[PDB]
Design a protein around this ligand. Structure first.
Ligand SMILES: CCCCCCCCCCCCCCCCCC(=O)OC[C@H](COP(=O)([O-])OCC[N+](C)(C)C)OC(=O)CCCCCCCCCCCCCCCCC
Ligand SMILES: CCCCCCCCCCCCCCCCCC(=O)OC[C@H](COP(=O)(O)OCCN)OC(=O)CCCCCCCCCCCCCCCCC
Ligand SMILES: CCCCCCCCCCCCCCCCCC(=O)OC[C@H](COP(=O)(O)OCCN)OC(=O)CCCCCCCCCCCCCCCCC
Ligand SMILES: CCCCCCCCCCCCCCCCCC(=O)OC[C@H](COP(=O)(O)OCCN)OC(=O)CCCCCCCCCCCCCCCCC
Ligand SMILES: CCCCCCCCCCCCCCCCCC(=O)OC[C@H](COP(=O)(O)OCCN)OC(=O)CCCCCCCCCCCCCCCCC
Ligand SMILES: CCCCCCCCCCCCCCCCCC(=O)OC[C@H](COP(=O)(O)OCCN)OC(=O)CCCCCCCCCCCCCCCCC
Ligand SMILES: CCCCCCCCCCCCO[C@@H]1O[C@H](CO)[C@@H](O[C@H]2O[C@H](CO)[C@@H](O)[C@H](O)[C@H]2O)[C@H](O)[C@H]1O
Ligand SMILES: CCCCCCCCCCCCO[C@@H]1O[C@H](CO)[C@@H](O[C@H]2O[C@H](CO)[C@@H](O)[C@H](O)[C@H]2O)[C@H](O)[C@H]1O
Ligand SMILES: CCCCCCCCCCCCO[C@@H]1O[C@H](CO)[C@@H](O[C@H]2O[C@H](CO)[C@@H](O)[C@H](O)[C@H]2O)[C@H](O)[C@H]1O
Ligand SMILES: Nc1nc2c(ncn2[C@@H]2O[C@H](COP(=O)(O)OP(=O)(O)OP(=O)(O)O)[C@@H](O)[C@H]2O)c(=O)[nH]1
Ligand SMILES: N=C(N)NC(=N)NCCc1ccc(I)c(Cl)c1
Ligand SMILES: [Mg+2]
Lengths: 459, 19, 98, 320, 347, 113, 52, 98, 48
């Protein structure tokens, strides 16, 4: 992985040694070049994962997440450089450094072969993320949002640290390849019930699981746009990726420990979808949309079927691009009217016709219009949960209906109707804003032509 | 608007003898 | 153990309680510190003398030397406490609650 | 060696450089009372260093290239604005007074550093010991709130305690009616707006509080307007003073060393002039503070530590 | 204080600590503590004000009491073994008295009350010695007597110290009282792992000293002793706010910083011995420490607090403080996690 | 093994860390970072100022780090030497098992239905 | 080399350097080169190693 | 209150630069920023990356598995053997308990 | 600009510069010869 780790680090010298007026051009261009080379990770085999060294390996699960992560860095740079224009030069370079360091921790997190190396990097992403939210957020509440984000995560992570170290003691290793062959079954006992909880609660909080999700709408509403992009696109998927790996050693206890969390997700997804119908804040609506989508991922990981794992892998990638696009779309409105109130600026399709096309495409992927990968992921999950229990189609069906209602409600309220009279600073969409939107939707729609590369190890 | 920063009311939360 | 140890250990405990249960005068507590050292001197001297631990016979003497350094240190602080407040009362030394 | 404990151990002790002529002298009086001229002549005759009264831009004179800085780098405090509109809503009156005290506190530290390190006495025009008379005049005329006075006293009580008062306090007693005529002759249009009641308040503080206090610990000389017109007679009085009172008798190398470590460290001197007490008159918002601080570092020779600014010709940066 | 007298007194503080660490005889261990206590008191009183006088008095009464309990343990040990060798003790009553004696010397809870008050009452340079160097001698004794220490007693002290340190720091605005309660909280981790692996007690001790030295040096550099005074640092020296942020996140134990290393190695040793509940409880309770570290980072680095007009005068003067070793210490405080296997040097 | 010795004599029978050791390169990097922080806190040009000072930061870190890495390697060699010799001294506590294949060992099947 | 375009070699060099280091890791993991049951064979007349 | 700077007005990048792409205030930098985003983003990553992905060699051996299965079905049906046996492992190599 | 007071670091302190560079050189030579000495001792003790 050094062909990706090292050039990612070299982005830091590049940013700091760039001319004062070229920090965005240089960092954006060279982070796109790194994104290009990440496609070499798709040298995947039918039987064996791609194991580079004792430290790093890349299978079909981590490969698409790595490519999503490295694609997101250039997009985040494009999305931030407007609202950071008045920033002090050094504080602009420190902002970019926080994003580069986040990418560094992320690509190492997704390829760590040892679970305790995964834990440290998994935890290391907190610091740059927290600093972005609290230093470069705009509102007073960004400070409270930082604390909720920090302490929700740590409340779960610290038990996970104890469980992993206990697992290394008893099994002798935490290398994920070794665990595949040395895994022993988990037999019922209160001791194992809490080993199971410690291994899964840290990841449940990151997804987040319904009930434990309150940190997420706070963080999104306060984060800067680049922070919201990485939060929704990648950092949520650290929970999913971690769960997909650790469940290997939790069998067969996962048979009955899953029930309380499937119930929370199946019911929680209807509850958070319905919350979206009455949200007044556009960013908060998108945040609650992520909770509903990630509920499906939690259910799919817990029912442990080949179809559900394929569906979860596609959902994580599809959600990553769609939710990131939606936050970017809402941000472009915010940079004009400087409010997140959804009902404030209406009828924008009249004033920004092409940006209204992006709003349409983003909404269609969010409601999972076939054959988007949003629909492929969501459909595969629904097929597998139906076999788990037929009655789940009722809850899946209702969520699909409510998901369409709030997706098109967001489209209709902001883009259609009459424009707000007194709002007269809706300038024409910039090239930067249109290119940012297209760099989200075009790769998302292109992946429909070749969806096998985002279906994960069980394809 | 512009980014919020602590004002005097906020700063006085940390000027007392105790929190 | 021998019965002498009952009263020497008792004397140490009495002075320890006397030290931990303050009244007003700081001088009174410094006396309880000096008494605690006196019981330790006697208690150590008995053991060493009775066991014929010849080289340990100097140990009680060394104990007194650092007892005086403590008493001198205690009195030095008492002088400063007295100068500040005009009494050696320990209730005056309460500025550092806040 | 830069001064420090090592230099002191090796023999840099103040008692070696101090003589009978190493004296700190402060000339005080009302506005337009002839302080400057008398102070300059005393300094020239006795062989001392003359410090012109500390103004807004005193600190500028001791750092950088010595020129005044733009007024935003002093808070925009204006003496002219004080004379025109002494009740300005923007708190200019107290902001100026707080700034002036800090400038005097710094000048006093610089003066003490000169006296201790070379043994040459100095002459000052007013000082931190007498600056309060202007604060009393401002408060008695309603130009500042009582809260400003409370703040001023807090800053003074934790700063003036650290220093020794001047050896000699020269005072020129010019009565207010003569002062008003002197201002009218001077010709500064802003200064003509001074009310006589304000001038009387300056005199009441000087006679009421300052001189009675200084008498206990310094040699005080009071000269009428005409006596002050001949500095040679003033110098004669200074040359025959007893010097029998005050804290300077109690000083020793051990104490003057500790005093010298303070005054040479200017940030340590100015530590408590910015106590986190949020008065509207002196509190600055973060956005204003950040912008001005950034502009300050963009000034010539101000980005780096003195001697590391290549924009003004500093050399051997890579070896310094 | 004469500069030569200050150096002689400082070298005597170190000599007393050294004597404790090199002595094979309980009497010389006791002498080392007494010599150390004698020398430090004038450092506390160096500024001669009522708060320094109160601090030194409270310190003297606590340390002098601990020494009497320490010597009582030594004499009881002599009765029941007839020797003075510094090693395990041969009487459980002696072990308890010595263990309590060292707990009071360290300021562990519930013998902790003096630490916040004494630290607040003395300068920052003296506070640095109190919370760092003064831990060496008592810990070096615990390192040698642990095979005879009562496990319930030592783990009780460790648990209470972590709780009281974490809770105590939540209510503090004074920096010296924040460091004091942080020190109490960190003392608990060192003793919690002592029964299982003394090597991890040294690691925590060394890393705690580096981070604590870094913070005190940065507070001294700016002559800041309160939260609000420290909140002006962004307007004087922006770089120092970033070092404080990195150091404080490290003291909170956040990966990938160095301060995570001791919490990580202590949890490993405890789990190897089938201690699961205690490390879990300890890690969660350490979130209290992270909370009031995070408040300082907010008021110091991640926001910009109101400034004063006179602050502009300071822009024109450079930092003159010595700040000895601060560049090295801050890097060690933050960037040491990749070298964790180097802990075997302490074995 | 030697009392209060940083590097006992027997440690010389181990190969010394290479001067291109990746761990040593990191230590040298920490010295470089310390040099940069030194310039920054003192408000000097961070990259340019005092290259003699920056060189000594790198050199001192690498010098100390080399010896720490050598002792680190030595202590892990000692741990293994102790561990293997103890296993040899107590065969009956570390008996070699008879290794059954998976065709013989019965494992229960848990369907994922 | 230009005064405007030397910073543009950092990331490309980092990739090349990382690529080189990645291949050197494979030189430490040859314990089973031509020894696995699945792929073990005889060397060709000129071949020295099945993979490098 | 305090001495604070008022909230600055909104800058419309189009006022000074009607041809602004929204990247930078400097028109020359604004053009270059647009060029690198479009060339490296669309022309390279999206166009070449899409082409690279389309021609990936037998991603996860799905084609080989189909060719191999054809070989097995051809063989087994010719020789009369079952297309696929229920037993994955040869039952002679297994030793059941009891 | 041209400073009103001569900066304490206005000119290089050549005595320190010499000591600093001389120490870096000295330590580097000491480190290398030690490493070479250790390499030869290691080969000697292991029969290489
Ligand atoms: C006609 C009716 C209208 C049909 C609708 C129009 C769409 C069809 C037009 C295309 C026709 C050509 C075709 O289909 O072949 C294409 C083929 C699919 O058909 P194929 O699989 O048979 O390939 C054809 C070539 N051979 C025969 C050798 C196999 O390949 C692709 O689809 C390209 C996949 C592109 C997806 C990759 C995205 C780029 C990655 C950039 C990185 C950043 C992305 C973000 C990160 C995401 C995480 C992974
Ligand atoms: C919360 C903080 C405040 C409360 C203190 C927390 C500590 C108390 C939690 C008790 C959980 C039960 C437990 O600790 O299991 C102990 C068990 C010991 O078993 P052991 O003897 O080592 O193995 C042989 C079995 N005869 O250990 C084992 O067998 C292995 C267990 C693996 C490690 C489990 C770690 C404990 C997880 C508890 C928290 C999990 C829930 C997280 C909730 C997060 C919510 C956001
Ligand atoms: C290596 C492997 C192990 C991994 C462990 C993690 C390693 C990182 C350890 C970091 C060690 C601390 C040193 C960090 C150096 C930071 C440099 C920097 O901040 O720039 C300096 C600048 C100071 O300002 P100035 O000197 O005056 O320059 C002109 C601007 N006024 O700064 C400023 O002006 C900024 C002022 C605004 C404050 C912004 C604060 C948000 C940015 C903080 C980023 C650093 C966070 C470090 C925390 C750990 C990150 C993982
Ligand atoms: C490994 C950890 C290394 C930690 C090194 C600590 C270096 C701290 C340097 C402080 C900054 C320099 C300074 O300003 O001096 C402070 C103090 C001297 O006191 P000061 O107020 O400066 O002046 C005295 C005049 N009355 O300076 C002192 O008194 C020194 C006090 C610190 C000594 C104890 C250091 C911690 C324990 C180290 C043991 C490591 C094992
Ligand atoms: C192969 C190298 C890979 C790089 C890895 C970096 C890891 C973090 C290392 C931390 C130590 C950084 C050096 C200490 C900070 C000093 C720099 C500074 O204070 O400001 C930036 C300064 C430029 O501004 P100025 O003050 O005016 O000086 C002029 C010199 N051109 O000086 C400069 O020109 C820039 C100097 C570097 C700026 C560093 C910015 C802070 C980085 C900390 C963020 C956390 C690091 C990433 C975490 C993952 C670690 C891999
Ligand atoms: C655990 C694994 C990681 C390994 C960690 C290793 C840490 C230990 C390594 C030592 C750390 C400290 C290294 C500091 C290097 C910087 C020294 C320097 O450049 O000094 C420049 C100059 C003084 O140098 P000078 O005294 O003349 O050189 C002769 C020394 N006998 O004048 C100056 O301007 C110096 C001022 C900046 C330095 C801060 C103040 C400290 C004073 C140090 C004096 C010099 C010490 C020489 C260090 C040699 C160490 C081998
Ligand atoms: C979000 C929170 C989710 C909470 C999910 C709760 C799941 C509850 C699982 C309960 C079953 C635990 O597993 C059960 O534990 C006990 C441990 O005493 C085991 O039984 C063991 O203890 C019991 C005592 O009660 C003895 O009678 C028994 O002889 C012994 O073997 C059982 O063999 C095992 O079946
Ligand atoms: C802060 C407290 C202040 C008060 C201090 C008072 C100190 C008094 C010290 C007395 C020490 C007596 O110590 C106690 O002696 C008795 C002897 O019968 C021992 O008694 C025990 O051990 C011995 C043999 O090992 C046997 O008698 C038997 O096994 C058991 O009774 C205790 O294990 C020991 O703890
Ligand atoms: C395989 C790796 C490939 C890496 C490719 C990286 C692509 C980066 C593209 C940026 C190219 C911009 O190149 C640009 O050229 C001119 C002439 O030298 C420089 O100088 C220019 O500055 C300004 C622009 O603000 C111009 O108005 C001026 O005419 C010119 O002096 C710019 O400072 C430099 O930024
Ligand atoms: N508000 C205020 N004004 C001050 C202060 N110190 C000086 N000034 C003003 O600065 C100006 C010059 O001070 P003076 O020296 O007393 O007046 P002068 O014309 O120079 O007459 P001389 O005594 O001969 O020097 C006067 O307008 C003073 O009012 C102060 O502390 N507060
Ligand atoms: N747990 C203890 N109390 N002691 C201890 N560290 N035992 C573990 C034994 C050990 C571990 C590493 C090394 I290297 C070495 Cl030489 C010995
Ligand atoms: Mg004048």
């Amino acid at each position: 992985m050094l062909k990706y780790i090292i050039p990612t680090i070299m982005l830091m010298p590049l940013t700091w040694l760039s001319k004062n007026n070229m920090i965005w051009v240089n960092s954006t261009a060279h982070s796109l070049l790194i994104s290009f080379t990440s496609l070499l990770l798709m040298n995947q085999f039918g039987d064996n994962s791609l194991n580079f060294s004792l430290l790093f390996f890349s299978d079909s699960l981590s490969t698409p997440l790595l490519i999503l992560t490295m694609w997101l860095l250039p997009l985040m740079l494009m999305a931030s450089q407007h609202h950071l224009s008045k920033e002090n030069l050094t504080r602009k370079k420190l902002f970019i450094t926080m994003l580069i360091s986040l990418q560094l921790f992320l690509i190492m997190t997704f390829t760590a072969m040892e679970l305790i190396l995964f834990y440290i990097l998994f935890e290391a992403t907190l610091v740059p993320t927290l600093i972005i939210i609290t230093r470069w957020g705009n509102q007073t509440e960004r400070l409270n949002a930082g604390l909720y984000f920090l302490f929700y995560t740590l409340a779960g992570s610290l038990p996970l640290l104890v469980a992993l170290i206990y697992i290394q003691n008893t099994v002798g290793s935490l290398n994920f390849l070794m665990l595949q062959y040395w895994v022993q079954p988990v037999h019922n006992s209160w001791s194992n019930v809490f080993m199971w909880l410690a291994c899964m609660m840290a990841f449940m909080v990151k997804m987040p699981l319904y009930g434990l999700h309150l940190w997420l709408p706070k963080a999104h509403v306060e984060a800067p746009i680049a922070g919201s992009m990485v939060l929704a696109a990648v950092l949520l998927k650290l929970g999913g990726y971690g769960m997909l790996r650790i469940t290997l050693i939790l069998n067969p206890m996962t048979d009955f420990m899953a029930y309380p969390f499937i119930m929370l997700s199946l019911w929680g997804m209807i509850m958070t979808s319905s919350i979206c119908l009455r949200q007044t804040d556009l960013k908060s609506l998108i945040a609650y949309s992520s909770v509903s989508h990630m509920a499906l991922v939690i259910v799919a990981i817990l029912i442990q079927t080949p179809w559900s794992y394929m569906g979860a892998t596609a959902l994580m990638i599809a959600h990553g691009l769609t939710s990131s696009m939606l936050f970017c779309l809402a941000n472009s409105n915010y940079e004009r009217i400087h409010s997140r109130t959804m009902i404030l600026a209406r009828g924008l399709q009249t004033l920004l016709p092409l940006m209204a096309t992006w709003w349409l495409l983003a909404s269609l992927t969010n409601l999972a219009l076939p054959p988007t990968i949003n629909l492929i992921g969501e459909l595969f999950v629904v097929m597998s949960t139906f076999s788990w229990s037929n009655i789940t189609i009722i809850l899946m069906g209702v969520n699909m209906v409510i998901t369409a209602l709030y997706s098109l409600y967001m489209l209709i309220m902001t883009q259609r109707g009459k424009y707000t009279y007194h709002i007269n600073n809706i300038s024409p969409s910039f090239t930067r804003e249109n290119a940012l939107m297209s760099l989200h939707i075009l790769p998302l729609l292109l992946l429909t032509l070749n969806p096998k590369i985002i279906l994960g190890p069980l394809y | 608007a512009r980014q919020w920063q602590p004002d005097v009311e906020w700063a006085e939360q940390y000027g007392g003898a105790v929190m | 153990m021998s019965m002498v140890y009952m009263n020497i250990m008792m004397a140490f405990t009495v002075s320890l309680v006397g030290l931990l249960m303050y009244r007003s005068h700081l001088m009174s507590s410094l006396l309880c510190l000096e008494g605690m050292m006196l019981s330790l001197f006697v208690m150590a001297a008995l053991t060493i003398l009775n066991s014929h631990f010849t080289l340990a016979s100097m140990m009680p003497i060394i104990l007194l030397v650092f007892a005086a350094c403590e008493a001198a240190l205690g009195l030095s602080l008492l002088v400063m406490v007295s100068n500040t407040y005009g009494t050696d009362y320990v209730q005056n030394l309460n500025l550092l609650q806040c | 060696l830069q001064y420090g404990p090592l230099a002191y151990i090796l023999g840099e002790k103040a008692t070696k450089k101090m003589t009978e002529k190493s004296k700190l002298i402060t000339v005080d009086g009302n506005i337009c009372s002839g302080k400057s001229k008398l102070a300059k002549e005393i300094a020239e005759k006795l062989g001392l260093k003359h410090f012109p009264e500390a103004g807004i831009h005193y600190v500028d004179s001791t750092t950088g290239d010595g020129k005044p800085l733009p007024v935003q780098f002093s808070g925009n405090c204006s003496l002219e604005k004080f004379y025109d509109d002494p009740k300005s809503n923007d708190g200019n009156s107290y902001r100026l007074q707080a700034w002036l005290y800090a400038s005097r506190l710094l000048q006093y530290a610089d003066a003490l550093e000169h006296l201790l390190s070379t043994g040459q006495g100095v002459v000052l025009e007013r000082s931190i010991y007498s600056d309060f008379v202007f604060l009393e005049a401002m408060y008695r005329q309603g130009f500042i709130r009582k809260q400003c006075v409370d703040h001023y006293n807090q800053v003074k009580k934790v700063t003036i305690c650290e220093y020794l008062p001047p050896h000699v306090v020269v005072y020129v007693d010019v009565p207010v009616p003569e002062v008003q005529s002197r201002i009218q002759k001077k010709g500064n249009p802003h200064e003509m707006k001074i009310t006589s009641a304000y001038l009387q308040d300056i005199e009441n503080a000087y006679k009421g509080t300052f001189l009675p206090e200084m008498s206990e610990k310094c040699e005080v000389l009071q000269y009428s307007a005409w006596e002050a017109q001949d500095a040679e007679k003033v110098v004669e009085d200074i040359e025959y003073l007893k010097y029998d009172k005050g804290p300077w008798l109690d000083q020793n190398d051990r104490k003057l060393h500790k005093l010298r470590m303070l005054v040479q460290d200017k940030l340590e001197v100015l530590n408590y002039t910015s106590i986190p007490v949020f008065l509207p008159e002196v509190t600055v918002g973060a956005h204003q503070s950040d912008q001005v601080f950034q502009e300050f570092t963009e000034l010539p020779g101000r980005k780096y530590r003195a001697g590391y600014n290549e924009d003004v010709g500093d050399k051997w940066i890579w070896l310094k | 204080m004469n500069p030569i007298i200050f150096i002689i007194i400082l070298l005597t503080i170190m000599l007393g600590t050294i004597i404790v660490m090199i002595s094979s005889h309980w009497l010389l261990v006791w002498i080392g503590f007494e010599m150390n206590m004698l020398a430090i008191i004038p450092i506390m009183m160096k500024n001669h004000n009522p708060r320094a006088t109160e601090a030194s008095t409270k310190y003297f009464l606590t340390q002098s009491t601990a020494s009497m309990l320490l010597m009582m343990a030594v004499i009881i040990n002599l009765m029941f073994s007839g020797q003075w060798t510094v090693m395990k003790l041969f009487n459980p009553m002696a072990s308890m008295l010595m263990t309590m004696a060292l707990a009071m010397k360290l300021g562990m809870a519930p013998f902790h009350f003096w630490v916040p008050e004494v630290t607040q009452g003395i300068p920052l340079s003296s506070g640095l010695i109190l919370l760092t160097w003064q831990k060496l001698a008592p810990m070096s004794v615990l390192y040698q007597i642990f095979p005879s220490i009562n496990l319930n007693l030592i783990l009780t002290l460790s648990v209470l110290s972590i709780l009281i340190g974490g809770w105590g720091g939540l209510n503090q605005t004074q920096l010296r009282k924040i460091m004091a309660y942080s020190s109490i909280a960190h003392m608990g981790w060192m003793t919690a792992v002592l029964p299982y692996n003394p090597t991890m007690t040294l690691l925590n001790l060394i890393i705690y000293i580096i981070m604590t030295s870094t913070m005190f040096t940065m507070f001294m550099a700016n002559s800041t002793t309160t939260t609000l005074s420290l909140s002006h640092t962004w307007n004087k020296t922006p770089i120092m706010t970033v070092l404080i942020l990195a150091t404080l996140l490290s003291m909170g134990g956040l990966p990938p910083l160095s301060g995570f290393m001791p919490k990580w190695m202590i949890i490993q040793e405890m789990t190897k011995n089938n201690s699961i509940i205690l490390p879990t409880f300890m890690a969660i309770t350490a979130l209290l420490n992270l909370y009031f570290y995070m408040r300082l980072t907010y008021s110091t680095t991640l926001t910009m607090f109101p400034s004063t007009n006179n602050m502009k005068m300071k822009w024109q003067f450079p930092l003159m403080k010595k700040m000895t070793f601060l560049p090295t210490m801050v890097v060690l405080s933050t960037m040491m996690l990749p070298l964790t296997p180097m802990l075997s040097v302490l074995e | 093994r030697a009392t209060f010795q940083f590097l006992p004599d027997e440690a010389r029978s181990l190969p010394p860390p290479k001067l291109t050791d990746p761990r040593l390169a990191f230590v040298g990097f920490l010295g470089y970072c310390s040099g940069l922080i030194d310039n920054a806190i003192r408000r000097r040009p961070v990259l340019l100022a005092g290259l003699h000072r920056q060189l000594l930061y790198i050199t001192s870190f690498v010098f100390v780090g080399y010896y720490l890495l050598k002792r680190q390697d030595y202590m892990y060699a000692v741990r293994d030497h102790d561990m293997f010799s103890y296993i040899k001294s107590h065969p009956e506590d570390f008996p070699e098992k008879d290794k059954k294949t998976y065709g013989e060992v019965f494992e229960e099947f848990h369907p994922v239905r | 080399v230009v005064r405007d375009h030397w910073v543009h070699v950092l990331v490309p060099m980092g990739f090349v350097f990382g690529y080189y280091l990645d291949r050197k890791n494979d030189e430490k993991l040859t314990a089973f080169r031509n020894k696995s049951l699945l792929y073990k064979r005889e060397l060709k007349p000129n071949e020295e190693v099945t993979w490098k | 209150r305090w001495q604070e700077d008022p909230e600055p007005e909104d800058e419309n990048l189009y006022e000074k630069n009607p041809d602004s792409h929204g990247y930078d205030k400097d028109p020359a930098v604004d053009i270059w920023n647009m060029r690198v985003v479009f060339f490296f983003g669309f022309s390279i990553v999206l166009v070449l990356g899409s082409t690279f992905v389309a021609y990936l060699p037998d991603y996860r051996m799905q084609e080989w598995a189909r060719r191999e299965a054809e070989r097995l079905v051809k063989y087994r049906e010719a020789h009369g053997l079952p297309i696929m046996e229920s037993n994955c492992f040869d039952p002679s190599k297994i030793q059941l308990p009891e | 600009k041209f400073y009103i007071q001569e900066p304490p670091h206005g000119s290089p302190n050549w005595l320190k510069v010499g000591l600093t560079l001389g120490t870096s050189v000295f330590l580097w030579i000491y480190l290398i010869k030690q490493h070479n000495e250790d390499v030869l001792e290691y080969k000697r003790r292991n029969g290489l």
